[PDB]
Design a protein around this ligand. Structure first.
Ligand SMILES: [Zn+2]
Ligand SMILES: [Zn+2]
Ligand SMILES: [Zn+2]
Lengths: 182, 431, 249, 381
């Protein structure tokens, strides 16, 4: 609920398309989100410009990684709310001590969990199988589990491969038992 | 249009060392041995899992950096005891710490704070008053030792700032005593004009390589710039990986006649690669069987050994990053380069610039400078130069392309044991 | 020993002394944790319902160990890859549960009890050869008297061990242990002492082994409770470890 | 001996007779372990029953000094602690721990009162001392055979009994639990004054019990049937009858009415019991109840126990707590033990050899032999 949704500008009409689920619509009118543009007057199919969708996905992933590695810290005290990029070596039991007030802890503005959840959401909005099993209903699942959508399924699998590749390089799927047991 | 009709092709914009003929020729990488500098620490040669930094780990890495540099400097200077930075000091005391800015802006003489390490100061900070220091040069993240007094317990007043101590140079073995002088052509991205994706400057540079037949060609990123106007606005009809693959194929196949060892260094601006520093080497391209021994996908930063000559290189714009934060009492680039060499790290700035993502465990493991390099390649948006900083030849070849107009590259000659004149000659030349 | 194996897991039973050093996946972490929680809960339920020496207890515990695929029987074949995998499971799962069961004294006691029970069962399933192997690998150095010395002290041995018949005694071999380890046996005078060594037959030994184990385990749990702040910061493992004791299985 | 004369003689003895050199050799244990003598606890009892503990000393000179200065009536040796007892106030709470001490046994004639007829309370006579003579053999054999303790010093307590100090390095590192195990293993006669049958052997006789009964048998006829005469009259043999099942009791009584000698009565009892088989061990239970040593597990269990020092002076008898030679045990006489008054008379009748002119010399010689054995063990090892 706190994750940014996938924004893609249609190459033809230039209208923003917000993607938050694999499938859009209800009943037999349900189709993959990247099949039709959000503008009724626009006939362009975003599935045609899947190279552009891939590029925008990579740019968004870079943006989120940059946000995480910016390392912005905010004081948890409402009356201080000090915002700094510098992590001080002076720590309390709860974490870094804010050097503006010297009495409250500095919390990450964009913690690791936020980035992990963002990448997981980008995977979610392209997970055909998961959407079919969980999100989609019975009649909708039947309508979507036929031909006329195989190409869309393949493109969605390719797009999910990108987010899967990125997540495979994240330390937030591996547990280092050396760090736990010492 | 503008690039193709340029008139200053081949102009030598800067020169250093022994004068050479108007034409440079190399051995085509015949009697050449290129490897990664074999030091105690293992090099970065493969991807490391990132995006998971614990604040405790960052604290530990920064603290151990300060502690280790301070230990080396204490042994060198025969300093007796370090004192906690925060405690009051009526008499003169020696304090080890790192410099920083009291606010988020750019450092100035009235905003300097010294943060001590965990061992001697429990990580406490103290404001610094530079009124009694006659000469100084400070940048954030700089590990320093200062003699000073803290009469109020609230403001440290330095009276002496100990100078930096660079690492010793490399003592080459005799194995390469009989090898000839080696020619190195170094160029840095961007490789295409701002309004094109055809890599015209790269083609010109490849022609130069085949013409001069250098022994090593060091290409630094970006190879697919993230700031390219076409990339940002999503006008590309092919995936980023495809463009990068085409560029690498062009580079490798086009250099076949020259037989030149290619050293490819990634850049943080590479839109197709992992955005983390230290950057792992490129791994999306498999050279043909006839080019495996010629292509070296190295990490950013890299310390290379070429017939015993140690070349340090980084794609990161260190000079631009540190020039925006360095404060001095009264050549600025020479000061910054000496700071880099004396701190013994390829990125001593803390906090970093806004354009670089730093994984601090990887930074600790792969940014220490093993020795002081004979040649130090530091491409920068600033002007090209060839400087001699404490016996190290620091070369900024500029960038191959400067907006719509063509840029510059550099060519230098290196021989182990020459005369310390390991760099016979060097030249910044136009493309 | 297929790809990435070694001599790290010689015997089935272990004292769980050396923490694992591998990098495992989150899925593997969760699977191992839950599986060992199921095993320990089964141990507790069977202990409450049945007498631990009962045959029903043994049968049900073997069934549970087979169902969850934990090492319970030896194999005089070699270290087969599958076997290695099982042992690795056991070794990692144990320490994971340590991280789960060190926050509160109550929890600690519970963990210790279940672990001891499991260990006892496994010891009860060890052939004499295997038993000695174990006693050697951990430097417990509990012996074995010669036949000649046995004949030398035949009558003393006969009168030492309760309910031991002449021929049946001839069919048995004893071990020499320092008397400081056989306190519970010497104290009621149920084992012969000669020159500072007790001559212990091949049922009571498990007790001593367990005592050692318990000591070690308690110490370990204390240390783990001392090293808790480093783990609480890992959100991924917080929902599990903080609530494993209250996990539906 | 006049106990009012005790305060007059104590200094001279502590000045010219107490064997300080050998005492330090003992408690210093060849200096192998640093701070071993320096961490030893002592306790002194001075005039008017004034008790002091946590006394420690730097070396022999300090001990000689402070002892000659205080002139204590009693000297007790205690544990070796983690730090020097003198500074126990300076040690952080819980960090002051008793770590090593000799394994010690106290056998006291008073604990045999319900089963001896010649004396009572603190009275002893030649007819009852054989009990101690039995104990030393029964126990010391175990300590030399079952446990393998090699350095064992038996000392007369001065009046009512004997102490044993087992000083092997292994025996000095035994935990409390191991000590309690050793004590319970050696202990057979269990029960208080409210129990009549204090020994109930099982069907199987543990080898240790067999060897203790073998040792008892050698002496039993002289001690119980000749000297003690445990079957002299009805008031006494009623007890032994009380120790056997009622079934044969009547059968015994008539027989005891026709016997003239307690040896005859013992023969008759043995024959009757043999005729009557699970009770075949009953005579052994009676022998043990009349001969086996009684051990206060509290004396030997605790590491922090303060026991009478060797070569102490008994506040009442005046006898010296002298070591007993194991070989010459049968010749030991607790009534010929030198008193302090006798050895001061001997001293004032004639530097490091003054004691050789008194009757104390052979006992210091036995102690010196024991210390020589300890030194040989410390070296050879
Ligand atoms: Zn559209
Ligand atoms: Zn604050
Ligand atoms: Zn008597």
């Amino acid at each position: 609920r706190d994750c940014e949704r996938f924004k893609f500008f249609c190459p033809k009409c230039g209208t923003e398309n917000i993607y938050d689920n694999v499938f859009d619509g209800s009943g037999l009118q349900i189709e993959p989100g990247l099949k039709r543009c959000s503008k009724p007057e626009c006939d362009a199919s975003p599935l045609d410009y899947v190279i552009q969708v891939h590029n925008k996905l990579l740019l968004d992933i870079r943006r989120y990684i940059k946000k995480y590695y910016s390392g912005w810290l905010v004081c948890e005290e409402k009356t201080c709310q000090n915002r700094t990029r510098r992590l001080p070596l002076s720590f309390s039991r709860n974490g870094p001590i804010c050097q503006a007030c010297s009495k409250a802890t500095l919390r990450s503005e964009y913690p690791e969990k936020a980035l992990y959840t963002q990448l997981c959401f980008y995977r979610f909005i392209f997970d055909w199988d998961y959407a079919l099993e969980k999100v989609v209903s019975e009649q909708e699942r039947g309508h979507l589990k036929k031909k006329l959508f195989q190409e869309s399924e393949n493109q969605y699998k390719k797009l999910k491969s990108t987010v899967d590749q990125v997540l495979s390089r994240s330390g937030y799927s591996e547990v280092n038992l050396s760090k736990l047991f010492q | 249009q503008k690039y193709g009709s340029r008139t200053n092709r081949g102009e030598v914009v800067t020169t250093y060392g022994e004068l050479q003929g108007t034409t440079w020729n190399g051995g085509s990488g015949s009697n050449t041995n290129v490897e990664l500098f074999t030091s105690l620490d293992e090099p970065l040669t493969k991807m490391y899992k990132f995006m998971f930094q614990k604040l405790m780990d960052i604290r530990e890495v920064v603290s151990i950096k300060i502690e280790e540099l301070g230990a080396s400097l204490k042994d060198h200077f025969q300093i007796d005891e370090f004192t906690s930075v925060s405690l009051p000091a009526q008499e003169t005391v020696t304090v080890l710490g790192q410099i920083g800015c009291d606010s988020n802006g750019k450092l100035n003489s009235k905003s300097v704070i010294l943060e001590g390490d965990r061992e001697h100061s429990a990580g406490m900070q103290v404001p610094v008053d530079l009124s009694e220091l006659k000469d100084y040069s400070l940048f954030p993240g700089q590990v320093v030792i200062m003699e000073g007094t803290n009469s109020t317990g609230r403001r440290f007043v330095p009276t002496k700032l100990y100078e930096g101590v660079p690492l010793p140079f490399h003592q080459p073995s005799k194995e390469f005593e009989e090898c000839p002088q080696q020619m190195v052509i170094t160029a840095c991205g961007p490789f295409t004009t701002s309004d094109t994706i055809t890599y015209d400057a790269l083609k010109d540079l490849i022609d130069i390589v085949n013409r001069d037949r250098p022994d090593i060609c060091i290409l630094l990123g970006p190879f697919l710039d993230a700031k390219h106007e076409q990339i940002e606005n999503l006008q590309l009809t092919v995936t980023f990986e495809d463009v990068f693959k085409r560029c690498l194929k062009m580079i490798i196949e086009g250099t076949r006649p020259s037989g030149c060892h290619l050293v490819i260094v990634p850049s943080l601006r590479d839109v197709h690669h992992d955005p983390v520093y230290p950057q792992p080497p490129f791994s999306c391209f498999e050279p043909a069987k006839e080019d495996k021994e010629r292509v070296h996908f190295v990490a950013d930063p890299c310390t290379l050994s070429v017939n015993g000559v140690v070349i340090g290189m980084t794609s990161t714009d260190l000079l631009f990053h540190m020039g925006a934060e360095e404060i001095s009492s009264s050549d600025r680039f020479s000061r910054i380069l000496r700071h880099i060499l004396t701190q013994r790290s390829y990125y001593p700035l803390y906090p970093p610039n806004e354009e670089i993502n730093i994984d601090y465990e990887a930074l600790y493991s792969y940014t220490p400078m093993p020795v002081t390099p004979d040649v130090f390649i530091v491409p920068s948006e600033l002007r090209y130069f060839i400087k001699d900083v404490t016996g190290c030849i620091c070369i900024n070849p500029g960038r191959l392309t400067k907006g719509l107009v063509g840029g510059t590259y550099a060519r230098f000659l290196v021989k182990s044991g020459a005369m310390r004149s390991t760099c016979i000659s060097a030249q910044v030349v136009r493309v | 020993t297929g790809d990435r194996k070694g001599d790290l897991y010689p015997s089935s039973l272990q004292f769980y002394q050396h923490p694992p050093t591998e990098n495992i996946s989150l899925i593997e972490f969760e699977t191992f944790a839950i599986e060992r929680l199921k095993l320990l809960k089964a141990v507790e339920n069977l202990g409450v319902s049945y007498v631990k020496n009962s045959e029903e207890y043994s049968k049900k515990l073997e069934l549970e160990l087979r169902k969850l695929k934990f090492p319970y029987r030896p194999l005089h074949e070699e270290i087969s890859d599958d076997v290695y995998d099982l042992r690795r499971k056991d070794h990692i799962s144990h320490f994971i549960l340590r991280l789960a069961y060190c926050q509160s004294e109550d929890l600690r006691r519970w963990f210790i009890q279940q672990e001891m029970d499991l260990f006892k069962f496994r010891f009860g399933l060890l052939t004499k050869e295997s038993v000695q192997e174990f006693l050697k690998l951990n430097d417990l150095q509990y012996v074995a008297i010669s036949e000649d010395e046995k004949n030398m002290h035949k009558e003393d041995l006969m009168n030492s061990s309760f309910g031991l018949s002449l021929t049946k005694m001839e069919d048995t071999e004893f071990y020499k242990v320092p008397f400081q380890a056989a306190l519970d046996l010497v104290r009621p005078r149920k084992v012969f002492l000669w020159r500072g060594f007790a001559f212990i037959p091949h049922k009571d030994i498990v007790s001593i082994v367990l005592n050692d184990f318990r000591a070690k385990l308690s110490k370990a749990l204390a240390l783990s409770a001392r090293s808790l702040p480093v783990v609480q910061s890992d959100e991924r493992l917080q929902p599990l470890l903080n609530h494993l004791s209250h996990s539906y299985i | 001996y006049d106990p009012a004369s005790l305060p007059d003689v104590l200094p001279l003895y502590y000045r010219r007779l107490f064997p300080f050199y050998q005492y330090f050799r003992w408690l210093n244990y060849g200096g192998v372990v640093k701070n071993y003598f320096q961490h030893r606890e002592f306790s002194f009892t001075l005039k008017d029953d004034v008790y002091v503990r946590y006394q420690s000393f730097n070396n022999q000179s300090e001990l000689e000094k402070e002892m000659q200065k205080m002139c204590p009536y009693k000297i007790d040796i205690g544990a070796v602690y983690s730090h020097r007892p003198s500074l126990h106030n300076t040690v952080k709470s819980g960090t002051f721990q008793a770590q090593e001490k000799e394994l010690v046994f106290d056998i006291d004639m008073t604990d045999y009162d319900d089963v001896r007829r010649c004396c009572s309370s603190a009275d002893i006579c030649p007819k009852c001392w054989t009990l101690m003579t039995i104990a030393v053999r029964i126990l010391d054999r175990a300590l030399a055979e079952d446990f393998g303790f090699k350095h064992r010093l038996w000392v007369y307590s001065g009046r009512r009994g004997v102490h044993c100090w087992v000083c092997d390095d292994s025996a000095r590192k035994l935990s409390q639990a191991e000590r309690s195990a050793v004590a319970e293993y050696l202990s057979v006669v269990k029960g208080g004054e409210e129990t009549i049958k204090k020994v109930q052997l099982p069907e199987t006789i543990h080898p240790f019990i067999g060897k203790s009964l073998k040792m008892v048998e050698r002496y039993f006829e002289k001690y119980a049937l000749v000297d003690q005469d445990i079957l002299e009259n009805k008031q006494c043999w009623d007890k032994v009858i009380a120790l056997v099942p009622e079934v044969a009791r009547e059968s015994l009584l008539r027989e005891f009415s026709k016997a003239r000698s307690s040896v005859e009565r013992w023969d008759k009892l043995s024959s009757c019991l043999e005729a009557t088989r699970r009770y075949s061990n009953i005579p052994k239970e009676i022998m043990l109840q009349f001969c086996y040593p009684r051990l206060d597990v509290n004396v030997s269990k605790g590491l922090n126990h303060l026991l009478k020092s060797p070569f102490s002076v008994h506040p009442k008898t005046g006898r010296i707590s002298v070591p007993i030679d194991c070989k010459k045990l049968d010749q030991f006489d607790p009534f010929s033990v030198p008193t302090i008054s006798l050895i001061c008379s001997e001293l004032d009748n004639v530097r490091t050899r003054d004691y050789k002119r008194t009757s104390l010399a052979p006992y210091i010689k036995v102690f010196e032999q024991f210390l020589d054995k300890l030194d040989q063990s410390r070296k050879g090892e």
